[PDB]
């Protein structure tokens, strides 16, 4: 039941700003002038080492990633909080994922502030890269139709 790697993938539509500012720290953020994404985690052993954000048209992908050099301590429970805030917002509801069973321990919360996205997918990927076959828990949220972002490269912020 262990894992050693976490990925967060956020796809959004439609978005207008492309210049972006990012930070990995106790509070991890990806910011444009129209959007703010914030990641806090707690008791998570794998370490986040960067984030990304790339847009094609008004279609964007973005997210946060750890390396895979360390496994999750199984005596504590990794907790992932993700907030997606419109700079033009007020109402702050959280989100419900596709139901499903998981082989690894973790908790996650996705909060959304604002109404500026027609489309929003959010994937949290807990992965055990010490597996022979693909060994990933995938917690998925959708607010409408599932966007395709293959073909959009995960560029760093700029």
């Amino acid at each position: 039941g262990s894992f050693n790697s976490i990925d967060v993938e956020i796809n959004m539509y439609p978005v207008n700003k492309t210049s972006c500012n990012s930070s990995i720290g106790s509070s991890s953020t990806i910011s444009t002038s129209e959007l703010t994404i914030t990641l806090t985690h707690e008791d998570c052993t794998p370490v986040f080492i960067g984030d990304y954000y790339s847009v094609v048209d008004k279609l964007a992908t973005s997210g946060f990633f750890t390396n895979d050099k360390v496994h999750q301590d199984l005596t504590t429970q990794c907790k992932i909080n993700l907030e997606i805030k419109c700079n033009s917002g007020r109402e702050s509801r959280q989100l419900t994922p596709t139901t499903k069973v998981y082989l690894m321990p973790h908790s996650e919360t996705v909060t959304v502030v604002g109404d500026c996205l027609s489309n929003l997918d959010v994937y949290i990927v807990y992965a055990n890269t010490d597996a022979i076959y693909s060994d990933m828990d995938v917690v998925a949220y959708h607010t409408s139709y599932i966007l395709n972002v293959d073909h959009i490269p995960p560029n760093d912020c700029e």
Partner: protein
């Protein structure tokens, strides 16, 4: 040709990259193919330092795997 190099990709975090390959002369632009953790391919331009370092990095990983 599974891929033909139109636009080149701008900087991708070296941590997200898992493989690179020389692209066929026949395929498209004679450039480098990059593979990401998400199982995706993008065409990069070998002259940029970033791509160069990326390559020396994956090269470093492939050795070690041996």
């Amino acid at each position: 040709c599974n891929i033909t190099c139109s636009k080149m990709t701008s900087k991708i975090p070296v941590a997200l990259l898992i493989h690179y390959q020389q692209n066929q002369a026949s395929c498209g632009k004679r450039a480098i193919i990059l593979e990401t953790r998400q199982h995706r391919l993008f065409c990069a331009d070998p002259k940029e330092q970033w791509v160069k370092d990326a390559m020396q990095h994956l090269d470093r990983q492939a050795a070690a795997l041996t």
